[PDB]
Amino acid sequence: SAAKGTAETKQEKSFVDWLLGKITKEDQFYETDPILRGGDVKSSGSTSGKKGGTTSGKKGTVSIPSKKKNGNGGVFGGLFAKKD
């Protein structure tokens, strides 16, 4: 008892479109939650300490050989490698 009709239809150009959007969230991608400053009181971030025991390790100008006399040797590769 029916055939065809008005399937395509949608006209929302009023304040209601924006108003109703406030009730149904209608958010985009705001995660920071800009309510005032950020919504995070936090506490701290410096309880640990490494101290400056040493002030010199690998300059990269006078330390290194700047030529590498060795290199032909090496059976595995991770035998004389340092990376503490």
Side-chain angles (χ1 to χ4, degrees), residues 3-16:
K4 236 63 152 268
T6 310
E8 301 211 347
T9 177
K10 172 248 213 245
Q11 289 103 37
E12 303 273 290
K13 293 300 231 185
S14 255
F15 72 96
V16 56

Side-chain angles (χ1 to χ4, degrees), residues 30-75:
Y30 278 115
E31 70 196 326
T32 182
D33 197 56
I35 60 113
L36 266 123
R37 51 185 117 199
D40 238 55
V41 58
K42 310 201 187 158
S43 156
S44 33
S46 200
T47 185
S48 23
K50 229 103 277 298
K51 252 107 67 110
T54 41
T55 186
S56 209
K58 251 74 224 296
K59 281 183 243 59
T61 53
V62 67
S63 256
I64 44 150
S66 214
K67 246 169 150 191
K68 261 200 262 146
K69 279 159 178 181
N70 244 39
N72 201 55
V75 188

